[PDB]
């Protein structure tokens, strides 16, 4: 049946890595995660290994992570105010891999949870 | 700083026309809106007006919607178990405009509130 179409919002002091946000790029809102901030350098291993300040972050352990052709050089320098975001499924490249880190403008908010059915 | 990076679910009985959805294309995950549920007929008006079953809905006041060049013929029924998903800023057409109506499976689920620095 119709629903009321309101999505609330709750403030809140600042993100964190690991968090799950919808970002905007390209007037397209996508869903990915907050990998690294202000002044972190953003690496690869050729064996699909993501690399944060020169570390394999441990919740980085499941994902294969290859760049995209067109995208930043590497490494990469996060600017400040910004949000370096990586798709869960890294096979879909269309995130900071190919558009940089994004300015706080571009990130609509944190997804805490979800509701779903069953 | 580091945050555990858990995205909870919350378990609910059905989805509700306007809820706002993250959806799955193409393995890409988006967000946007349900627009219609099995059953219904989508149609579009030439000057940009969304129909469903042959009523222009209150809450489509605010959209100016075109069809994409590429995706189903209009009007379109919506199949048994699928959802048609408009994304909010109507000009990015990659949402069942294109993809037809999706079924649950590629309903991630709903977004119900967004946490947001200020």
Avoid: C, W
């Amino acid at each position: 049946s119709a629903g009321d179409g309101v999505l609330y919002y709750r403030l809140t002091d600042r993100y964190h890595i690991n968090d799950v946000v919808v970002y905007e790029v390209d007037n397209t809102l996508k869903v990915g995660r907050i990998a690294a901030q202000a002044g972190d350098e953003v690496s690869f291993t050729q064996e699909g290994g993501l690399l944060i300040n020169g570390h394999p972050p441990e919740k980085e352990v499941p994902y294969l992570t290859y760049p995209h052709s067109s995208g930043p050089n590497f490494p990469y320098k996060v600017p400040t105010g910004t949000y370096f975001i990586l798709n869960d499924y890294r096979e879909e490249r269309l995130d900071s891999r190919y558009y940089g880190a994004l300015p706080i403008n571009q990130i609509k908010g944190k997804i805490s949870t979800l509701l779903r059915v069953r």
